[PDB]
């Protein structure tokens, strides 16, 4: 039939594991897409299909084709670290039975395997562009055989988008030059069903397969009043509630119960965090009321759900009070205020189906995949704005649990004044994807183009204006416009007038400075790099070594609305603040004559010096949070003192750990060797949130800060000690912190016996690799 | 007879090597000294013999006895690093065929083996006391089986003298306390012919053997005018010069020539460095004039002396212009201005006898064993003072080449007005040794006693006044007085009032602070520790990271007359000094108005304000020298810019590398973890004198800074790559940097091929031990 994979002749290892996953047969569209033509022979490829359509199986089989036959290496580029982690573990399981070696470059993580050892690198767009810049420096690029891009529709919509354009255009510019002046580097792109996907394929010189095939039919609708309208706005049903809900009038609660009785999950998107908490509370209390008054009441796997609650309660943040009542009933909320492990457990319980209503903010839609039968979206308005059509289609695209459901369903709930927006979301379609490099004429030229011109010149490609114009023709801006060359000449002038590059007579040839090479190696933005360089020179002339705060002042990202800074707390903290830390404050320019003003009331903040002073204050306040965070003050206690949420601290912690890496490599390339000593410790130390004491022990990835804390406190101060310890000892010490209540991000929950064995065995593995 | 070592029944591996060293038969006094009684069964021993006796053979046979039968470890304590290096390589060469493991602790040297893996530790006094303090902290002391002390006469007078008393008293106090409430630790003490040696033996509970047996009879006389007088002032000979002179009237050149008429060699001691240069020059001119005008002229085998000159000229210092003319005629000078490798090569050539007249300052006489046949001493008046009788007897004690001569001779040259002093030195005898612990009139307490009470209390022995009085009874001050207890209670009060210890109610019990534990663990002086701790807090509140200078300002030893500071140079440098370095100057407290004053005229500091102000200036000036030395500015260029001699920089460099270790460990115990990062690199960088990148490579002991520079510059950036290296490539590099012209301190000179092979083999050995 050529559809049972055995006909294709895959390695038996992957065949059996796909059968364990369930992929005994590929869909006709996947078979055609691999057959399509020069695709199978190495031509670039772009394809789009619904997320349910088996989207990634095509790229996975092309990776095997290249990696086994060519024995060259592949990149996998993913939009988010949560996706990147999950895909790394999936690919490891399948390929490790082959013996193909997989590890990833994600967030502040770096692999223990050096890239020479790897076959496949799974990475976030930011780390992907950083890798390619290193591959240009080494001139290693010949090593790459494939570059797979997910969420290629990001190309226009974010700061991550322009990095994807600057990434792909360097590979195009270098490869086509080397080829023109079989396909060595193949691109496989996956995207949303963009209008101008024909253009993206033609720009990449890809082959294109667009399909809207889904494994389960999707039924959309909108609900307004009691009426449920099909997308064509014919009435398909008139709703009348099975459940006499008291909590709210939109029937959102009774519209969930309608399918829960059919034993299927609901997923429910809410405009905001506190709304998601309040609505998840109401649904759980109506589940309890029905059961307490008692179609049947809900049937719940309560032994499984208490195992889920135990896995939550052992987290550093414990079990949230709202989750405590809602989770045993089988309702849960998921929003940016939850910690990463806490979300992952809620997500994992929903995939199994132990949770049956999950409410979420829209961030779940673009993130990790969950199948849900009934997807309810409460309003066409989110955050005080119309919902974006990309987000709506990423939400509804989840509907229908493939192979379990006969059909998927979605109900957009809407009011009369909003109905016009609800209709528009159903019938509308995405904007064409559009290069971010288009000149914003109120500036000199867009910072993404200045980065672009920096990356080539400092890279040592297109050292001359004719080559920069040739790279311009590869740029997707050119294919989208097919002013650009005038914008490029302005970028060169800006870089030259800000001493990132030197101009010399031969036309002209442009050379990097140390400041240029440090900017490219760090991956910092160059406009930011001026103030980073100015602040580092201001600090190195009068540094405070008696504490961690001044180092953290340089490491902390600038204020990016990551929380509302409660000035009353800040002025209260300021009086208590130690005089040693007040010395750090007045060195960097914090002044209480202005901090008293912010607690007295809103500052007008309409002038650049008040803007920078406010940024000084707001950067200082953020640096105090990081000082408490790396002293192992629990997340619950930072929240008491500063008032920010658990998820705000963790997202600040992850981004600050990335910025600590940038500042370290920036200072190294400049040659501030003293600063490299101090700051290099802080990337790992911020990433896990630990004292200096633990930084060696945390190398075992099965150990978080708290598990490292107890193994350290027991006396296993080094990986050698932890490898010498008996498994029974680690078990007692882990229990000192016969059922699965340890969470490990790459795994389901471990028992203490199983975790302790793998901890000892990983420590022995680390020593084998470290000594070798 | 059975004085043949084969009758004693030593291990053949040492017996054969002693035969290779000519030690086929022990002297009768050595046989008796080992037989003497309970000495052979583990009783403490003190013994005294002339330096040219077989003095160390007794201690060497007692070491073998303990380390083979008990398998406990031994210490060997020596007064100077040069002796400690020499003795370590001898003991390695002798014992390593037995499998006994030997290494040592000398200045900033630390062994690659941890102490548990040694059998014998060869230590400078200062590092030996530091070891015993660690052995108390670990409570490892049971591991020791023997402690051998040389130069017990140092106990009386040196600034490193009392440190040997504090060392010996702790071993006595702990051993007697634990044994009373076979001899586990045996002391073997070599000593001068002290008057009160019987007291030292009784204090140490030692057996005693004292002899004046010499292997060659000594002749000893004083010369005034043309008359050579015996010790009784009877005339031994009338003197008339065999060789007429022009340089000086005392016939010193003719008195050398009398033995240069034969194959024997003269060692000549001079009261000053520049006098030694001028007198060695004059002797070489008159040797040349004799050969040029021509008893036979000298026979020199100049093929050997050109190899000696080639081994000098390879050194970073080159060949000194005064050595250049003098060395080929077989004359050499030796003084504290020479580089350490220059001294070692000049010493080595004199032992072989290629150099026939060596002129030296007094430092050689105490420093290292050289056989010399006639020893001439040029005045009773060294440095404007009469010689110390210890120094004279050390100078004369060298006379007579064992087994070569029938007699040794020494002549003291003396003028008519001096003659009374010359005879006084010739007839007189050493002072009895004394504790150097009694406080003088107007002192509160001695710093040695404060250190004594600190070391016990913070060590955790004698936490109470009755035990401090019991340790007092062990102190040699008690045996010499047999006020001390009143001085102890004043020391406890001083420590308690300066917060080194805490007082608590039970009598009383005294506890260490962090400051106490840090000052003990660093081995700093406590009075110095106050100003060190005050300066570290003042620096950590306003540090300069943009250069190495501020770190060096904390690391540089306090000014110790190591140079005459040319203030005119200092003011000339100050105007040129970069504004960044001037910022370091203004932070630490340097004032240009006072610096112009020192050029304007001699400044005498009359008050404590001016003493520390001047000390700030002098400490700053010294810190600039270390900054240029750490840049690898060649010693010649430092000498040009700052004025000081090679030997002053190197002795400053060694002492600063010790002090860098003290401040690193001091900052660790206080918990200034940022200061650990900066300062810890500087101990190695100061020791070898290297930029940061070389710090990994120089740990291969055959590799100096210049050899590391050329290997690094070639690309062998790591010891792994140096283990990978092809030996022929190292040969080509070192030749690029035929004959024996490399110098290695533990060896004779090496061929380029032999050094290259051992460099690679050491790198492989380093990897094996490091991985294991």
Curated annotation (Swiss-Prot), chains A, B:
ATP binds at residues 30, 49-56. Residues 36-212 form the Helicase ATP-binding domain. Low-fidelity DNA polymerase with a helicase activity that promotes microhomology-mediated end-joining (MMEJ), an alternative non-homologous end-joining (NHEJ) machinery required to repair double-strand breaks in DNA during mitosis. MMEJ is an error-prone repair pathway that produces deletions of sequences from the strand being repaired and promotes genomic rearrangements, such as telomere fusions, some of them leading to cellular transformation. MMEJ is required during mitosis to repair persistent double-strand breaks that originate in S-phase. Keywords: Acetylation, ATP-binding, Chromosome, DNA damage, DNA repair, DNA-directed DNA polymerase, Helicase, Hydrolase, Multifunctional enzyme, Nucleotide-binding, Nucleotidyltransferase, Nucleus, Phosphoprotein, Transferase. The keyword Nucleotidyltransferase applies. One of its GO terms (molecular function) is chromatin binding. Belongs to the DNA polymerase type-A family. Residues 738-772 are annotated as: Interaction with RAD51. Residues 247-472 form the Helicase C-terminal domain. One of its GO terms (biological process) is double-strand break repair. Homomultimer; forms homodimers and homotetramers. Interacts with RAD51. Interacts with ORC2 and ORC4. Interacts with RHNO1; interaction takes place during mitosis and promotes POLQ recruitment to DNA damage sites. Interacts (when phosphorylated) with TOPBP1 (via BRCT domains 7 and 8); promoting POLQ recruitment to DNA damage sites. The chain holds residues 67 to 892 of 2590 of the full protein. A motif (DEAH box) lies at residues 150-153. One of its GO terms (cellular component) is site of double-strand break. Highly expressed in testis. It is found in: Nucleus; Chromosome. It is linked to Breast cancer: A common malignancy originating from breast epithelial tissue. Breast neoplasms can be distinguished by their histologic pattern. Invasive ductal carcinoma is by far the most common type. Breast cancer is etiologically and genetically heterogeneous. Important genetic factors have been indicated by familial occurrence and bilateral involvement. Mutations at more than one locus can be involved in different families or even in the same case. The loop 2 region is involved in the binding of the 2 ends of resected double-strand breaks and homomultimerization. Changing residue 55 to M: Abolished ATPase activity. Residues 36-472 are annotated as: Helicase activity. This is DNA polymerase theta. It comes from Homo sapiens (Human). Its main location: nucleus. Phosphorylated by PLK1; promoting interaction with TOPBP1 and recruitment to DNA damage sites.
